[PDB]
Every structure is written in C-alpha cells, then in structure tokens.
Amino acid sequence: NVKVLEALELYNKLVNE
Amino acid sequence: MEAVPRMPMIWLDLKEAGDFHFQPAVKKFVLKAPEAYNEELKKLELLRQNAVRVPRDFEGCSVLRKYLGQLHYLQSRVPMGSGQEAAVPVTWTEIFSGKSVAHEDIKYEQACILYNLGALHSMLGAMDKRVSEEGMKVSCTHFQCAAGAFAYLREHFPQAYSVDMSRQILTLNVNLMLGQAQECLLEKSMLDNRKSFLVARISAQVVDYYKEACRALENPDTASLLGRIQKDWKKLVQMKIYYFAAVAHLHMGKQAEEQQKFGERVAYFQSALDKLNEAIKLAKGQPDTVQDALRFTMDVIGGKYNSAKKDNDFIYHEAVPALDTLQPVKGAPLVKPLPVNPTDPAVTGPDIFAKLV
C-alpha cells in the first residue's frame, strides 16, 4: 500500500530513532 | 493502555450538487473554429453524475479524483472560468445554511468536488474500529488525505465561493483531521509498545492539533455559522484535549518509573488523574463509547497513582516536584496534509477531450 506507506513514514522515522 | 476502548471520530458530510450545464457552452465554443466533442461531452456528463452521487466507499474517492482531473483538462481547452466567454453557472448547496450558491466559474465545481473528496476520506477514516494495526494505519492515512484535500482547497481556491469553504473553516477541518490522524498513531504507538516517552510526545501532539481545532470552534463568528455542529464537535474535541493530556502525562509518569524517579512519577500520575477527571466532567452526556474509554483509563491511571504514591510515602520518600519545574513534553508531529495533484495521470486517465485532428 503506497499511500499508507507514505502516511506512516514520519512515525517510523521517529520510532526507529 | 493498549486495550483502551477507542474514541469515536468526527467526519464531514458531502456537499449536495446543483446543475453544471457545460455541454451547450462547450459546443458553442468549439463550433467557433464539426460535431463538437459530442461523444466526449457525454462521457464527462456520465462522470459528473457518478461523482455527484458518489458511492460512499474507497472506489468512490477514485471517481471524485477522476472527475476533478477531467475538469482541469476541460478548463485548459475551454474558457469556463470567471469572466470567460464559455462560463456557465455552477450551483452547489452551502452545507451549513442549506442555501443554493451559484458561480459562473468551473473552478467552483472543482472546489466542491475537492471538498467532497476530503469529506469522503473523513468518512472512510472514521469507520474502522481501530483495534487492528492496519485499521489504525488506514484510518490515519484517510484522515491525512482528508486534511490534504481541504488544505489544497484552501490554498489553491482562495476565492472562497461559500462560507463552508472559507479559509477559517477549511483550516478547522485540516486541524481536526490531522488531530484524528495523530490520534490513530497514538493508538498504534501503544499497540506497538513504543518507549513511554515517545507515546507521551505523540499524545502531546494530539492535544496540540485538537487545541487548534477547538480554538476555531470557539470563534463566535465561526460558531454561529456552524450552529449545532460547533456544539457537537466541540464536546468531543474539548473532552479529547484533556483526555490525551492525561494519556501524555500517564506515559511521562511511566518514563519516570523507568528512570527510577519516584517523586516525579507521582507528580505525573497525579496530573494525569486530574486531567482525566476534567475530561470525564466534560464528557457528561456523551455516548457509551466515550464513557467506556474514560472508564478504562480511570482504572489504569487510578491504580498506578495509588501504587506510585504508596511506594513513595512508605519507601522512597522523594519530594514530589511541581510540574512547572520539569521539562515539558514537546509534541511530535507525525501527520500532514498529504499532497493532492488534480492532474495526476494515474488517477485521471487520458484527457477526455484529446483531439489529434
């Protein structure tokens, strides 16, 4: 899911330090 | 806690369309150079009909986007903008007053379609129960898409054709959607069991977005415009402000527990309990869904406060600091109005009015 992937980018950057 | 019953979400109604009789104007314009885009106009007419009566599902978003794109293609070939020679009346219903508002401007039609794209996304985001991780992720995405539509609308359609699409109102819509998007991420952060400090930053951001939303709802002129919608939205939003403030401080308390700072731990837990009680007071009369979430959180925060104060009073004997002496939580913005591109070939398909000879 391309849209969901982009939408979740900031979240994942935050949690992965 | 990860198992907390989910708060309900706000979504927006789609605007109702009147007429947009583009065909006679288009034909008259192209005859000014044989059978005048006749099949092509028929296709666009069908596309509008599908769009203005859009199925309230995910495929419906595609319908709205495709029509929006073809409207841009038409705009570029036939002058139907304000003051232009092939412009015809566009009529839509202003959603707050129920008034029919007309403009001889194809951009007005584009604007209302873009509005309904945002509204439909707000609907789709609010339907999942958000107990699943994917439910949270997809709901979050929809809310960011809704924010993206309203934000694009506000910035690229500045004429403000009707009060329901004014800069103030659209900004309220944007901040509400971003708040609900960030809230989905808070739910995910707890399901993923992230570091307590991160959960606090995420929850603190939820509060920040909701504050800006509540701010706009507390504008008296905006409030009179919305009427009972303002009353209905503000009940939930204001409640959520104290709720997610409580959740933030609950997790700052958890960080304190991890850092073995037991005085600080009591201070944060007490703050959370005070804030939650304020949310409970504000939630009077609201649905069982809201009550069930608050009940659950009262159990968690209430138990943890008691244990924390118990351990400190009997064992650790640490000073309970005033909150104003502690480093305040900085909100972590993890959501944004996702970019809309009206002329994206992926969503529009071929220019309906493509003319080789």
Numbering used by the authors:
A (entry chain C): 351 to 367
B (entry chain A): 1 to 33, 38 to 361
Paper text:
Herein, we identified that the residues 350–370 of STAM2 are necessary and sufficient for directly binding the Bro1 domain of HD-PTP, and determined the structure of the complex to a resolution of 2.0 Å. Therefore, with the expectation of altering crystal packing and promoting crystallization in a STAM2-bound form, we prepared a mutant HD-PTP(1–361) protein in which Asn33 and Tyr34 are substituted for alanine (referred to as HD-PTP(1–361;NAYA)). This mutant protein binds STAM2(350–370) as potently as the wild-type protein; this was confirmed using ITC. After incubation at a molar ratio of 1:5 between HD-PTP(1–361;NAYA) and the STAM2(350–370) peptide overnight, we crystallized the protein sample and obtained novel crystals with the space group P21 containing two HD-PTP molecules in the asymmetric unit. In the HD-PTP(1–361;NAYA)−STAM2(350–370) complex structure, the STAM2 peptide forms an amphipathic α-helix that binds to HD-PTP, mainly through hydrophobic interaction. In detail, the intermolecular hydrophobic interactions involve Val354, Leu358, Tyr361, Leu364 and Val365 of STAM2 and Leu189, Leu202, Ile206, Ala336, Leu338 and the hydrocarbon portions of Lys141, Lys192, and Arg198 of HD-PTP. Specifically, Tyr361 of STAM2 is located at the center of the hydrophobic cluster, suggesting that this residue plays a key role in the complex formation. Alanine substitution of this residue completely abrogated the binding interaction between the two proteins, as confirmed by ITC measurements. Along with the hydrophobic interactions, we note that hydrogen bonds mediated by three water molecules also reinforce the intermolecular binding between HD-PTP and STAM2. Intriguingly, we found that the STAM2 residues 351–353 play a key role in determining the binding partner of the protein; in the superposed models, this region brings about steric hindrance with the side chains of Lys151 of Alix and Arg145 of Brox, but not with that of the corresponding residue Thr145 of HD-PTP.
